[PDB]
Amino acid sequence: ATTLKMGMQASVGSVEYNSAKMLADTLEEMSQGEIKLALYPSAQLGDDRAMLQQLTLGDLDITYAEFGRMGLAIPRAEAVMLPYVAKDFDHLRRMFESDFGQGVRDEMLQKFNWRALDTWYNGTRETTSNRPLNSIEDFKGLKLRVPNAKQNLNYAKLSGASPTPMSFSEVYLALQTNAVDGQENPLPTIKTMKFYEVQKNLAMTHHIVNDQMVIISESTWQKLSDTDKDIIQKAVQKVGDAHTQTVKTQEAELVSFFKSEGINVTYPDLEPFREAMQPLYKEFDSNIGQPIVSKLAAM
Amino acid sequence: ATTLKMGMQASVGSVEYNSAKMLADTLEEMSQGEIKLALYPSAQLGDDRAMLQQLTLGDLDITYAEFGRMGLAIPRAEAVMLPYVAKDFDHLRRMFESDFGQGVRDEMLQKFNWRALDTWYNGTRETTSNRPLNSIEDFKGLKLRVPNAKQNLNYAKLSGASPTPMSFSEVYLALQTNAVDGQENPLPTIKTMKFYEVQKNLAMTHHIVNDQMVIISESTWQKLSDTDKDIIQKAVQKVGDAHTQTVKTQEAELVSFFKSEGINVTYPDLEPFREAMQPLYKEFDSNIGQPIVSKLAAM
Amino acid sequence: ATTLKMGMQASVGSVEYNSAKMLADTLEEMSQGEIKLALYPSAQLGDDRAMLQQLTLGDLDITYAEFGRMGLAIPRAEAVMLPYVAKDFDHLRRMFESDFGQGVRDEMLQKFNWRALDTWYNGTRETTSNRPLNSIEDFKGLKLRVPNAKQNLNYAKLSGASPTPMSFSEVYLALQTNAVDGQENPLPTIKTMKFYEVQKNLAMTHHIVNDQMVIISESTWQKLSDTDKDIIQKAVQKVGDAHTQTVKTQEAELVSFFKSEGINVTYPDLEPFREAMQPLYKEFDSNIGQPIVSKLAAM
Amino acid sequence: GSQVQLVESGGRLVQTGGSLRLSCAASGDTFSNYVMGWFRQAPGKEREFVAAISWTGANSYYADSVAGRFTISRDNAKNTVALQMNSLKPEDTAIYYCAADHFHVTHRKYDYWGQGTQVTVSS
Amino acid sequence: SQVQLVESGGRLVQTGGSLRLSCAASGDTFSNYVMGWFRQAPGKEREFVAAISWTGANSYYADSVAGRFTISRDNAKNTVALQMNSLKPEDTAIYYCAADHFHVTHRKYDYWGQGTQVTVSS
Amino acid sequence: GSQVQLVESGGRLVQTGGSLRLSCAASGDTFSNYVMGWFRQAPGKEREFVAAISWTGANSYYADSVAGRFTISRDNAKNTVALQMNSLKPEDTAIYYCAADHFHVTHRKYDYWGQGTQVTVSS
Amino acid sequence: QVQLVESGGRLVQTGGSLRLSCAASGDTFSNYVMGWFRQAPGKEREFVAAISWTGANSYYADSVAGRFTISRDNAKNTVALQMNSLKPEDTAIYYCAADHFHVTHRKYDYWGQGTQVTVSS
């Protein structure tokens, strides 16, 4: 048999983990036990960057990463993750399926041993805080946790906020300690991690759309049989359809949930957030050497 | 962060203080530096009555008091400490746990800003003296120190001693100078305070069972987050199980110890004390306006 | 009224039985005769596995089981009873309330109709034998009785006896006739069963910590009124506080008791026992497909 | 954790009053951890429970439809479960499914399943 | 010599259910004895259930259980078993394993087990 | 503040012969008042002492199992202690705990603990 | 196991007469000595009267001697307490109680819910 190892930052009870367990169950069933998937959640193997590095070197088989996280290796790919450039998941999927997207996927595989099997919707990131955020002016002086990702940092700096990079595992403590005033994530994770227990406000800022690629190590992939490869490809897309729908279903429901949990939910005006990112796009094109932001936005 | 202030009459080296530090430590650790508990022992803020008044006005956050001490504010509550009505702690805890106990717990909170988080066993009171006390007949002309509580006094008078109300801090010296002939307390207290050094006789009278509620100021409680409330509620319940156990263990050990210190220990006949209290149960029920003693004795 | 039926392997006069009759009484008193609890001890309905099966099918209402015994139905739950992984009741109880614990309890109910209302301490298992057990080598060739549980089998196997599975009712006889050389159980049962009369050695091996969950059939639970549910939950908690408590007291006394009955008590070096378990822990993680060993041991 | 893989055999064309023995081979997780069950389904129709056997074989459960005619047994050495069917009538015609679960259950699916073997009883 | 008998299997089962009892024998040579199962419910005298010959060729049954129960023996493992099917509340009893040199009905069995309780719930 | 709060970071999957740096961030009481220590625990066992460093960094203590391979260091401006691990083997797989105490002690448990970062070394 | 239910409680005056009745259920009524006990507020339980299985023996407190009469009916499974010449000192909750034998060193095994008698001046 072949036993594949999958690492993820998401913890048990998350939508990402439930999908990874569904994949593990289906793979073992569809293979009658010849394909096994071991799960290593809660970032016990490292963060997404560390696990991506493990795939590149052949030390880990499968992991999650956003298409924009590929900017860690293929700088132009970060553009899909620039705040507010992608309008919804379908737009992001179109970027993923375009010739530009196909170019990145080839470079991932050839230069970094990353084969993206599929990409799922993981939600649109919103902002929680200990004080209300009615307008962009309210972000000034906000102690906002961000992941160690440039575009989340950019969102916060161009917020007017003070960005604080910290790992996903430390976030809850920091809200309960009010070491940070706020954090930023999609709504399904905000419930799963129980961030709402330690955050009195939710600011529907819709600033970044997160996908979720399922990436397998190319050296592991080429060791699979064509029969195993077919099973995996088919399972991943089946679980992804469930994952994408689950996130959409939850995101439509989760707001009243927060309100019935006494959360103050604010629909701030996004236009000033939106204008704040115009100087950043011109950046990005200049740093890459080719304009790309306008091309992606128009897809 | 939040720094809570806790006052107590008990001195360092007592089970009450050791439990209160143990709490203070658990609070700081389980909250990760969040919740600190400052301790003010040896009645430096006043007696339990004064500290209760400080909680009511929001000037002190936490203190100890027994459920029967609530008779200072809710007269019917004194019935629980009437001499010999409660045999032992389980009976007293059941009274605290009945519907009657929870009318009292509600009236404490609404009228006096006292939220009882838990109640622990603090021991059953015995009588020490400078002369041997084989029977209730021997108490007569005994200058018996009692607290700044009516029901401890009632025990003294109806046993026939001459009661001397006195503050807990003044007791050791009053026994040393033979200004008083005897005093009344649980054995862990007799040891911690070292009354046995100044008392040659110990009379197992078992006349009052002491609980000890942990009381938080309601105005202080309501400024807390729900997570802090849970941390505190888990902590007090955990130290109480230990506190209750230490009292049970020590109460089993200490008679032999005092013997090892040449203390003459007398197991007097306790029916003659329970006849002396029969008119008191009469008087109490008549005063309050509604029968209750037969209620509680039957729980 | 409703009369609920509880089955158990324990016999009358055991710590388990005294609590269930005490439990019977408490509901019998607080409910004013409207909830009655009939008891069926001494495994007359079958072993715990059979009685658990009766709860799932709605044929028996209440039973005892250890949290690790849930591994019969929810494999990851077996990890808590893996030998020496759990240090003390507090550590084991923390597993029960962790997110992992709540996950198991949710799966117990809604795949298997088992409501864990509480879990109590029943003691840490020690090893008795007819010959002295000074070191890990005194186990070689030892015919050690174990229960009808894999992790007790593993403990015997990995220290080096040849394990002999036997039902709890047959044990005293196999020791009396030297059909088996030793058995392994917590101390309070070791006396109540009178295992010590037929056992010359007590080997403080501390190998497994046992809890004592009270499980009600979920189909029976939904059949009660909300008032009854509170009486039961809280009554169960009432007896559990006492039961867990009684066990700690006895485990503190009974080692001395056994000495006074000419029992030889041996404190062997446990380091080779803990080392013998490392391949077992590794393998279990692999069998579950996800690490849970390291997580549970660290709780 | 590790799951169970099941493969049934024995399915055949038989006559009214005939007898047929089905067998199911189990692999993967430890066979003795599971209650083994037999289920049958006709075209359309809702799963029908037929029989189940406990881990050690001490308990057996049967549908009223087959209580006197069918017998379930298991072999924990060979890791197989068997269903001896006697006095079959044409309404016994179905795909017969081997199923495994940690406990016998009635409020839900069994956890693990075989591929089914078709039994045809002729009039 | 004398024969020792030990039953196991006793359980709570439901109406229509099936249950397997087993009895383990030691002491004198197991194949010298006819093995029997007897039961007593509260209110009644001990009732004969089934008996099996030394080699298993003969089997004897009570009319109350003739179609439902099956007795068998294993002379290698020295056990006798009673497979009970279609259990009813009326089958509720303590069930006894018994041994004698051959089956007898006019007198009582020589050697006896020590009982396994079967409870059948509707 | 009377007490120290500790947070370890660094836990990763790494290979035999690889190197990994753990870091611990301290808060609360004055960091230079404490000897900082590293401990590790595998499931079922005792915590193993790994390394400790004195208040000023002048004295360092090491387990024989990690001598020459591991290096402990501290930064009293950033209030951090670090453990440089080299030449790791699978037996180094454990949860590694940052700990603080006023003095280095061997007869007792350190006073304060973070909860640790998981180090996994692959064969 | 015997269940007891009292009836009869009323406001009566000084000098008045009142008949209480107690209905017994469960176990065989003639196996039990039947007793009446009373409690005034604050005051301990007072023994009032008891009657043997057959009614041949009767026991009375001195406080009620000559005034109260206990009787039983083993067909209807009832015991009665006929009270005459009450006055306020008889104001109490009256309890029906059962035991296999009349006992004075201990508490009767079985008891009721009680019935209130009020005698006003």
Would you call E13 an interface residue with chain D, using a CB distance cutoff of 8 Å?
Answer: yes
* Cα-based distances in Å from E28 to E75, E104, F4: 12, 19, 74
Class of residue G65 by CB neighbours under 10 A (exposed 0-12, middle 13-18, buried 19+): exposed
Residues in contact with C227: Cβ distance below 8 Å, sequence separation at least 6, in sequence order: none
d(CA B265, CA B203): 6
d(CA C118, CA C108): 14
Q: Which residues of B37-76 are buried (b: 16+ CB within 10 A; e: fewer)?
A: bebbbebebbbbeebbbbbbeeebbbbbbbbbbbbbbbeb
* Closest Cα in chain C to E115: C44
Phi, psi of G89 (to 5 degrees): -65, -20
Q: How many CB atoms lie within 10 A of CB C141?
A: 10
**Minimum distance, in Å, between the CA of residue F56 and any CA atom of chain C:** 31
d(CA A81, CA A277): 12
Q: Which two tokens stand for residue B61?
A: 């956050």
- Which residues from chain B sit within 8 angstroms of residue F111, using beta carbons? none
d(CA C296, CA F98): 19
Residues in contact with B53: Cβ distance below 8 Å, sequence separation at least 6, in sequence order: B46
- Chains in contact with G, where contact means 3 or more Cβ–Cβ distances below 8 Å, are B
d(CA B126, CA B131): 15
CA angle, corner C295, sides to C292 and C296, nearest 5? 85
Class of residue A117 by CB neighbours under 10 A (exposed 0-12, middle 13-18, buried 19+): middle
DSSP label at residue G40: -
- Quickly tell me which residue has 């059979």 as its tokens: C50
Q: What type of residue sits at position A296?
A: L
Note the helical H segments in D7-72: none
Residues in contact with C148: Cβ distance below 8 Å, sequence separation at least 6, in sequence order: C47, C49, C165, C167
Do the beta carbons of residue B60 and residue B220 sit within 8 Å? no
* Closest Cα in chain D to E8: D58
- Which residues from chain E sit within 8 angstroms of residue C38, using beta carbons? none
DSSP label at residue D106: S
Do the beta carbons of residue B158 and residue B152 sit within 8 Å? no
End-to-end CA distance of chain D: 45
Q: Which two tokens stand for residue B51?
A: 């500290």
Residues in contact with A200: Cβ distance below 8 Å, sequence separation at least 6, in sequence order: A129, A130, A131, A263, A264
Do the beta carbons of residue E93 and residue E41 sit within 8 Å? yes
Do the beta carbons of residue C201 and residue C128 sit within 8 Å? yes
Residues in contact with G61: Cβ distance below 8 Å, sequence separation at least 6, in sequence order: G46, G47, G48, G49
C-alpha closest to that of B211 among B48, B44, B54, B42: B48
DSSP state string for C114-160: EEEEEEEEEEEEEEEESS---SGGGGTT-EEEE-S-HHHHHHHHHHT
C-alpha closest to that of F99 among F7, F1, F10: F7
Residue C249's H or E segment, with its range, is helix C226-260
Q: What type of residue sits at position A25?
A: D
* Cα-based distances in Å from A42 to B20, C83, E76, G22: 36, 26, 55, 70
* Closest Cα in chain E to C166: E8
Q: CB–CB of A176 and B226 under 8 A?
A: no
Would you call B227 an interface residue with chain A, using a CB distance cutoff of 8 Å?
Answer: yes
Q: Which long-range contacts (CB under 8 A, 24 or more apart) does B231-235 make?
A: B231/B27, B231/B30, B231/B31, B231/B34, B231/B35, B232/B27, B232/B35, B232/B117, B233/B117, B234/B30, B235/B23, B235/B26, B235/B27, B235/B30
Do the beta carbons of residue D85 and residue E37 sit within 8 Å? no
**Minimum distance, in Å, between the CA of residue A40 and any CA atom of chain D:** 14
Q: Which of F43, F46, F95 sits opposite C85 (nearest CB)?
A: F43
Chains F and A touch (3+ CB pairs under 8 A): yes
**Minimum distance, in Å, between the CA of residue B123 and any CA atom of chain C:** 17
Would you call A36 an interface residue with chain C, using a CB distance cutoff of 8 Å?
Answer: yes
Phi, psi of C34 (to 5 degrees): -85, -20
Three-state SS string over chain B comes to CEEEEEECCCCCCCHHHHHHHHHHHHHHHHCCCCEEEEEECCCCCCCHHHHHHHHHCCCCCEEEECHHHHHHCCHHHHHHHCCCCCCCHHHHHHHHHCHHHHHHHHHHHHHHCEEEEEEEEEEEEEEEECCCCCCHHHHCCCEEEECCCHHHHHHHHHHCCEEEECCHHHHHHHHHCCCCCEEEEEHHHHHHCCHHHCCCEEEEEEEEEEEEEEEEEHHHHHHCCHHHHHHHHHHHHHHHHHHHHHHHHHHHHHHHHHHHCCCEEECCCCHHHHHHHHHHHHHHHHHHCCCCHHHHHCC
**Minimum distance, in Å, between the CA of residue F82 and any CA atom of chain C:** 21
Phi, psi of A268 (to 5 degrees): -65, 160
* Closest Cα in chain B to G42: B282
Chain C 90-149, residues with CB within 8 Å of chain F CB atoms: none
Q: CB–CB of D103 and C53 under 8 A?
A: yes
Q: Which two tokens stand for residue A296?
A: 């992606």
DSSP state string for C35-68: EEEEEE-TTTT--HHHHHHHHHTTS--EEEE-GG
Asked whether the CA dihedral A73, A74, A77, A79 is positive or negative, the reply is positive
d(CA C188, CA C15): 7
Q: Which two tokens stand for residue D2?
A: 């590790």
Gyration radius from chain G CA atoms: 13
d(CA A98, CA A102): 6
d(CA E23, CA D22): 29
